[PDB]
Structure formats: structure tokens, C-alpha cells
DNA sequence: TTTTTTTTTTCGTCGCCCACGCTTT
DNA sequence: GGGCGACGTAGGCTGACTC
DNA sequence: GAGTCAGCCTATTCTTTTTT
């Protein structure tokens, strides 16, 4: 919420920060969250330019030791976008939370993109009846973004039309390097607007196909880590929920389970860098089962939703 | 689709274009959908050259953020090919869609190569009766391409008969590889003439046999993923409909099932997420099959019914 | 039908061409119909030795796109061996075509080997009478190959005798492994003389007996999906007319299902179904076929093979 | 003239089988 | 009705025999 | 009395469920 126009001051001109702009940084909270090395590789930045930039960015960002009675009253006003369902909102104690990565893995025909389609329409509702009012972002990397399914949920939620269809930025990631450069552009839109969501559908779809052979595994999880850290600097900067959708693999070995293995794709890189992880599952007919699979404050309980003609629901 | 020669400017000499055309990059929308680490693995191309290519290609291909209103206006002009059956059409809301991979699994004699023979005569129809006004590629992998069915679906409708059999490219895949190489030779054929179909008679047929499992399960699924990736590049670059046919493996146990040989598609979880829509051809009575939408991001899970008939899939 | 000796060129020494003959590959076609990954596993070929094999092979045998009107004038030269009948020759549109597998399941006594004893005599008739032109090759596996039935089918079409019995190669399977190494010695005699049929009777017979239990249902169906693949190779190069004989199990759900499962049901163009009727008259219903409608007919096993 | 640091990372499902058993004036 | 077992368990070396 | 020829740990022990 602070563009770099309040940092082009105090012994710093705007020409040097003009380099920061094309370096990726568009916020005062984006250079302060960045280390010395990352901003020292930029052509132009002298070590002094670097230490001055950091010390003057520290001025406008709280970087210190707060108490836990001041962090409790900052998360008592956190916005929680509601999913379409009520049995899925009770399980999550309020819908997807803002300022945290929320993975949704599952296998197929489970509802990983129908939740991401009823979330891009509820995150446009007043906070008093749903999500936090603001636009959304759909970074679709599978080809499945149906705008005809947004007008179905925005016929039950009372939202009208092309208004819903308009406050949804949509981008299509074609490879694994254009996925990560589609965020240096998203951080340019989120500061000249008010977004309240960032859906990255199948965030790990273009990793299964780009890096393959076990000789490209340390080079894949060193890119996934960068991705999920760049996606964690968008959730702390502007406070936007970051639902990321994942996939599953099948460990073909000793059962040691007695049973069908799912074990979502992405190792201990997308597992240790994710706040909540919902495990969607197939059920009888149109009913699905969503089990919380990891969360710092939520019980490991189960729920029940259904993919209606209006997105997920009851 | 603009050829690679279209980007030949800005200090990109013709040798670069030529050495990019030998790696399977024949379109300017095939070098902008390619990661840099894959343009680096090409002889001659260095880091600076790769960056130059990837910068001068993103100026010729739209790569950015667009609202969901200029995507709901480029999606209302999606030509949907008729499948030959009204019931099948209603279930699929109009017919196979352009720009997507549409899988069709099911046990033997269900109809998966007859909805692949009535589909390649319908894509050559005018758009007023359902079609694409183009040609129909047919990369068959099992040897069951019979052009005497394209000469009956061409009499049910009204086409000539000698002009429907001329607008059908045919190629037989003989290995797990080669099958992909046909998709690399397919970019050449599709840049020049207008194609509107990419039928693959059995994608996961040569994967079995060529791979023995467990030992090569991992290897087979990184070769299948690199096949369903070309199938998506060709679809999102040429705007064609990549129909595709799958086989079936019976869950011998563990599935903990009960009914008759519950059957699941082969291919694992890498043909399950890659495919946009999945249709399940089942069999009923004498000449009456069943079709249930397994997976689809827009279509409700329904259940239609069709008949192989003598003039191709109908009702 | 090009001996692999033709590949002996461009850095292809007799060391390499020899190396190919003891792995199975005997025709240059069989090498272009072969994955890259399979070449390295053969000893002596490491990285670019294998690649160079395929590069010159791909120029000899053509593998690429072609119009579907120059495939019609390839499907109009199919030999279509007659199965010594007329009611079974109108059900099929001219008997067993060449270049495609054809399973014939049924039950005991139906006549799956009495049609394999008529397609070993009517595959040597002149192409005018309705047969092919060459030599049958019976690969029997159950032990039922009585050569007094392919001599009483020869005293019906005017064929002399011993000569009809001189063009029918024979081999017993013995094991599930011996019957797939018999397809590698068949590719050695198809490249010299002209063969027009591979009866391979009693397939999937030593699979229900050698590989037994749900424990082997995996290695049975990747040793049967490879047998049915080597069988599709000899049907593509030499244009032979591979016939296959299945058996059945009894569905105990609540009922004659052929053995093999979804492995033998998928890798098959046409698929007949013999069934016993009254007296010596059976029923042949086309289970599966990619072009031919699904109907049924009536044949009869009289004293000279399949008759009417 | 010299004087050795420093680990990283998971990925991939497959293959159907086997018939039984008379009983009722 | 009731049935399960399958890498990529390598490699260096203890059991064990083999001369 | 070392040569092949071998059969297994250097490390343990989670999933977690559908499908008719
Ligand atoms: N000309 C025809 N007239 C009527 N029915 C036909 C005709 N040709 C084929 N059929 C029927 O269509 C059925 C389906 O054949 P096909 O479409 O090849 O099945 P499939 O599922 O593709 N088989 P496979 O590829 O071996 O798994 C056949 O089994 C026949 O019953
Ligand atoms: N309009 C609709 N009405 C009812 N049900 C629908 C509708 N659209 C989709 N569905 C159902 O919801 C599912 C949507 O697909 P979804 O489960 O979101 O894809 P996914 O799990 O991401 N699969 P993939 O991306 O291929 O791994 C379908 O399989 C249908 O069962
Ligand atoms: N010379 C003959 N004259 C008349 N009928 C004959 C003659 N030879 C055989 N048959 C009949 O043909 C039947 C079928 O034999 P065959 O073709 O071996 O059956 P099958 O079902 O293939 N046997 P199997 O392989 O054990 O399942 C015999 O059982 C006899 O009834
Ligand atoms: Mg979706
Ligand atoms: Mg077929
Ligand atoms: Mg027999």
C-alpha cells in the first residue's frame, strides 16, 4: 500500500529507484522485505545506494519486536473470504483467510477449480455478507478458466453481471518462467487498485512437465521455492489471500498404509511454505469431502460440500 | 499462427530461424510458450541469443493480464464440432470445443474410434451446421483407421466423398516416440493449411508395451507428460480441437470395489489433470452405447446415449 | 520386407547389423518400428550408435503424414483370405483381411481350430478363388494340430495333397516364453519366402496355466501385451493375416468372457465369437470390429472343414 | 609466500479370475 | 466369493560354498 | 583362505481412502 514515491527522498533521487522499478520492486514494503544481496545484483546500485535504500525503507515499515496483544488485535480484523458452502465455512472457521497461502490439492473431478471459481465471485462481496470487497486474480496455468461459471455463482449471490466478469484479472501462464514473471506484473496492478484474492490454479502444473528426469529436481525445487516466496511477499505486502491449487502423485511402493496414495506433488518445499492445506476428495454423486490436511490453528477435521449449478455449495 | 520467419528481425539472423525450425519450433507462438532453459539446450543458441528471442517473441504473442470480459468475448466465438449425435451434443453443450484436449476412454467396442471417424467428417462442414471448415489430422496408433467409414459419414451429411478423404491427414505412430514426432511434424502442416482437428486414435496405447511398469512407471509418465504438453501447445497455438482416445485397466483389487470389473483409465494422474474434458463411453444394448461426462470444468456430470449406426455415431 | 543387411551402410559395419539379428530385428521395418529406449538395452550400442540406426532407417521405410486418399488405395489391395465358406464370407466382407489380428473365442467344441485348419489350406489358393498366395504358419500350443484335417480341406478345392501340407510350418508353444521366442524365428522365414497367415492357435492358453494367481496377473498381462505387440509387427511389415484363438472364463457375478482382459480386447481389430448351435452348425457373431457391422451368421463343420 | 570452504532435492500406477447344484406324487 | 504383489534395494559384505 | 557368488542392511515404519 506504499508505492515507491515515498522512498525517492532523503538523500535519494528518483533515477536510482527507477532501476528498482524494472528490477521488480514497486513498493516500499518490497525492498525492505528484500535482502542486501538481491538488491545489490541490480545494475546501478552502489553498496551505499544499497544500505541507504534499506535504512530508509526500514523507516516506513514496522521492523521490530511487537507484543502478542498488539498482534492479536491485528488478526481480529483480518478478512476471511467465504466459500459458497456453509459446512465448508464452519470447518475453516470463516473462509479462506487473507495474507496466507492456502493450498488446495486433490486428484481430479474433485473441485479444485470450482472453488477457485466461487472464490473469485465471493471475494467481490461486501465484508458484511462474504469476502472482502475487491477484484481478484486468476493466473490460470491449465487452460480451464470458464467465465460462464462466474455468471452462475453471480446469479445466486445477487451480484449482477459483467461487473463481476470485469473485476477479475486473468492471465495464462505458458511456461514455468512466465508464471513467475506474471507476478512482477501482478504487484504492479495490486498497487493501483484494491485486490482481495490471488488464485494461482495448478501452481505446480508447469513443473511436472518442464523439469523432468531427477537431474532437474534440485533445479525445480529451487524455482518452486522462489515462486512460493515471491507469492508470500504478495500476501504480506497488500494482504491478499493466495489460494494456490495443486495436484497429486501416487507413491508406488510398500503400502505401509494398509489406502490409495495421493501425496500431493511438490516436496517439502510447497509443504513447509503453505499456511493451510485442504485435501479435496470425491464422494457420492456431486458431494465432495474437504479435509483440513495442515493448519497452524485449525483442527484436523472433515467437512462436506457439493458442486451445484452455482459453484460449490451445500 | 505466424511462422518463425516472421520474427526474423532485430538482429535475429536467418541461421537462428533455421536452427529453431529443426528443434520443432515452427511458430512464433511456439518460441514464446517455451521456457528459456529449453531454448538454451539448442545448438548454437547462447544465453544472450535466448534472451533476445524470448524478448522479441513476447512482442508478437499476447502474454499478459487481461480482464475476464475480453476473455468471455474470445470464448463466445469457440467453434464446436458436431459429434454426429443430438443426445451426445446436448450432453456436451454443442459438440467438441476448440482449443482443448478431450479424452474418450472406455472398454472395447464402445465406439471410441467411431466418434473418431464421424468427428473427422464433421470438422470439414461449414460452421452453420457444426464444424471448423478445415481439415482433420489423424495420428492413429493401433492401425484401426478405416476410410470406408469416412465415406459413410460423408453420405449421411452430403459431402462429396472424394473431397472428404483428401482433407484428412493420416499418420501411424509405431513407437512411444515417433508418436510425439508426428506432433512435431504436425506444426509444419498446420502453419500452412487450416486444420481443425487433431484426433489421436489411442494416446496411451503405445505407452503400454513400450514401458514395463514400476521400473519405468516414472519414465513413462515423464514421456506422457511431454506428449500431453505438445497436445496442449498445438491446441492453444493453432486453435484446434485435440480429441484423444484412452484405454482402460481393470482394478483387480485394493480398489475394494463390488460391481462388475470397475474400470479406470490408464495413464495415471498425468492424463487425468492434463485432459480438460473426459468422456466415458459405456455399452448398453445391441447398438446403443452410453456417454457420461467424467471430468469437465464447465459441463454438468450427465449421461447421454448414442448409436454406432451404419452412417457413423448418431442416435 | 527389407533385410536388415540393407542398413549396412554409413558407418553401419557388419558388427552392428549382426548385433541386430540376435535381438529379434531382422527387417529394417522392425527397427523403425522400435523405440529409442530399446536399442541401448542391446549390448554394444550405447548412445549415438542407436540414434544413427533410426536415422537412416527412417529414410528407407517411410513413416510420416500422408493424405487419406492414398491410404484408400492401400486398403483396396488387402488380400482378404476366404474362410472356406459363403455364409461366413458375407458376415465378414470377404473373410479374414490381411494385416490385422483376429481373435476367435468361444467354448469347447465350437470350432476355433477347425477354422484355423481351413485358413491353412485356403491361404494357398490362387488369389482369384479367394485366398491369399503363400505359406501358412501354424503355431499350435495346445497340441491339437491334426494334419488330416488340412488334407481333407485340400481334397475340396482341387489342391493336390502333400504340396498343401508342404507350406504349413508347425511349432508347439510348450511355454509362455517359448511361444514368444517362436515369433522371433518366424520373422526369419517370412523375410525369405512369402507367408500369408500366422494361425498362432491356442493363444492365452499357457497364460492361465503358467502365470497363476492375482500375484501374477501383472506379469501375465505385460508378457501378453508384449506378445500381442510382436504379433502386430509381423502383421505390419509382411502384411500377414495373423489369426488368434482365445478361450473363455465363466462370469460368476450373478456368461462367457474371453481371457486376456482389457489387454487382449484392445489390441485387436476384429474379434469373432463362435458358439455351438444344433447338430454341426455353429454361430459366428462379430464381437468387435472397427469397420464391419455387428451381426451373426451360420456355418457348419462338415467333413471338409468349415462348410455350409 | 600463503591458504581451503560448502549441501540439494522427490517422482511415478498396474494388471482380472473362476461354476454349482437335484427335487419335488 | 475370494482372492496381491510388483523398483529404480544399489553395494560391500557375511553366509557359504568352492576350489 | 581367497575366489566367486551371494541377499540384505547404511535407514526405518506412514496412510486414511473410493468405486457400483
Ligand atoms: N459399419 C458398421 N456398421 C455398424 N456397426 C458398426 C460398423 N462398424 C463398426 N460397428 C460397430 O461399432 C463398434 C465399435 O467399434 P470401435 O469404434 O472400433 O470400438 P473401440 O472401443 O474403438 N475398440 P478398441 O479400439 O479395440 O478398444 C463395433 O464393435 C461394431 O459393433
Ligand atoms: N455446471 C456444472 N454443474 C454441475 N457440476 C459441474 C458443473 N461444472 C463442473 N461440474 C462438476 O465439477 C467438476 C469440475 O472440475 P474440477 O473438479 O473443478 O476440475 P479439477 O479437479 O481441477 N480437474 P484437473 O484440472 O483436470 O485436475 C466436474 O468434474 C463436474 O463433476
Ligand atoms: N472330420 C470331422 N468331421 C466332422 N466333424 C468333425 C470332424 N473333426 C472334427 N469335427 C467336429 O468339430 C468339432 C470342433 O472341434 P475343434 O475345432 O477342435 O473345437 P474347439 O472348440 O476349437 N476345441 P478346444 O481347442 O479344445 O476348445 C469336434 O469336436 C467335432 O465335433
Ligand atoms: Mg475452475
Ligand atoms: Mg479402436
Ligand atoms: Mg483347439
Return the string of H and E elements of chain A.
HHHHHEHEEHEHHEHHEHHHEEEEE
Helix count from the secondary structure assignment of chain A: 14
Helical proportion of chain A, percent range: 25-40%
Q: For the report, how would you describe the main beta sheet of chain A? A: 6 strands, mixed
Quaternary form:
part of a larger assembly
Hetero groups in this structure are: phosphoaminophosphonic acid-adenylate ester, magnesium ion
Radius of gyration of chain A: 21 Å
Distance between the termini of chain A: 37 Å
Strand numbers in spatial order across the main sheet of chain A: 7-3-8-9-10-11
Largest Cβ-defined interface = B-C, 52 and 44 residues
- Please count the beta strands of chain A (DSSP E, at least 2 residues each): 11
User: What overall form of chain A do the CA principal axes indicate?
Assistant: globular
The percentage of residues in β strands of chain A lies in 15-25%
| Computed structural class of chain A | alpha/beta
Amino acid at each position: 500500500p506504499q508505492p515507491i514515491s515515498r522512498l525517492e527522498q532523503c538523500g535519494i533521487n528518483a533515477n536510482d529507484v527507477k532501476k528498482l522499478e524494472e528490477a521488480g520492486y514497486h513498493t516500499v514494503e518490497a525492498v525492505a522485505y528484500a535482502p542486501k544481496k538481491e538488491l545489490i545484483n541490480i545494475k546501478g546500485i552502489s553498496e551505499a545506494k544499497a544500505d541507504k535504500i534499506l535504512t530508509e525503507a526500514a523507516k516506513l515499515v514496522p521492523m521490530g519486536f511487537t507484543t502478542a496483544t498488539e498482534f492479536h488485535q491485528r488478526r481480529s480484523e483480518i478478512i476471511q473470504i467465504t466459500t459458497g458452502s456453509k459446512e465448508l465455512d464452519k470447518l475453516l472457521q470463516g473462509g479462506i483467510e487473507t495474507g496466507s497461502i492456502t493450498e488446495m490439492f486433490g486428484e481430479f473431478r474433485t473441485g479444485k477449480t470450482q472453488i477457485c471459481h466461487t472464490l473469485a465471485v465471493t471475494c467481490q462481496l461486501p465484508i458484511d455478507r462474504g469476502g472482502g470487497e475487491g477484484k481478484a486474480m486468476y493466473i490460470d496455468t491449465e487452460g480451464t478458466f470458464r467465465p460462464e461459471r462466474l455468471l452462475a455463482v453471480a446469479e445466486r449471490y445477487g451480484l449482477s453481471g459483467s461487473d463481476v466478469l470485469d473485476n477479475v484479472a486473468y492471465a495464462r501462464g505458458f511456461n514455468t518462467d512466465h508464471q513467475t514473471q506474471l507476478l512482477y506484473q501482478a504487484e504492479d496492478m495490486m498497487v493501483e487498485s484494491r485486490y482481495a484474492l490471488l488464485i494461482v490454479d495448478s501452481a505446480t502444473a508447469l513443473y511436472r512437465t518442464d523439469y523432468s528426469g531427477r537431474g532437474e529436481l534440485s533445479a525445480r525445487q529451487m524455482h518452486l521455492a522462489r515462486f512460493l516466496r515471491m507469492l508470500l511477499r504478495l500476501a504480506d505486502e497488500f494482504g491478499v489471500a493466495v489460494v494456490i491449487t495443486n495436484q497429486v502423485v501416487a507413491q508406488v511402493d510398500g503400502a505401509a498404509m494398509f489406502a490409495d496414495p495421493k501425496k500431493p506433488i511438490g516436496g517439502n518445499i510447497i509443504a513447509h511454505a503453505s499456511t493451510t492445506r485442504l485435501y479435496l476428495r470425491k464422494g457420492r454423486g456431486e458431494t465432495r469431502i474437504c479435509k483440513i490436511y495442515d493448519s497452524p490453528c485449525l483442527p484436523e477435521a472433515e467437512a462436506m460440500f457439493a458442486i451445484n449449478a452455482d459453484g460449490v455449495g451445500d
